[PDB]
């Protein structure tokens, strides 16, 4: 029986993990949560007199 | 008996 690369932004020094063949979603709200978190931040931080 | 692709514009790195 016994028989992710790190990406470094040159401008920000920010290290991002490049997933190795990994697109796994862990659970209900694991990726659903990311949607809400995205929409929250975008709308909260953004501004346009018109919208 | 006993490849990866790097986006130069987004810096996005992806396994083949």
Torsion of CA A48, A36, B15, A21, to 10 degrees: -170
- Residues of chain A with Cβ-Cβ distance to B12 below 8 Å are 7, 18
Distance CA A17, CA A8 (A): 9
Contact A5 B13 (CB under 8 A): yes
B7 touches chain A (CB under 8 A): no
Task: Please calculate the CA angle A12-A17-A19 and round it to the nearest 5 degrees.
Answer: 145
**B8-11: which pairs have CB atoms within 8 A and are 24 or more residues apart?**
B11/A7, B11/A9, B11/A16
Q: Are B16 and B3 in contact (CB under 8 A)?
A: yes
Structure resolution, Å: 4.3
Q: Looking up tokens 């987004």, which residue turns up?
A: B10
Q: Where are the beta strands (DSSP E) in A1-51?
A: 5-8, 15-18
């Amino acid at each position: 029986v016994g028989f992710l690369v790190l990406r470094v932004d040159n401008a920000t020094g920010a290290v991002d993990v490049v997933t190795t063949l990994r697109e796994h979603e862990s659970s209900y709200g694991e990726v659903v949560d990311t949607y809400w978190l995205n929409q929250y931040v975008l709308n909260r931080e953004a501004y346009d007199y018109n919208t």
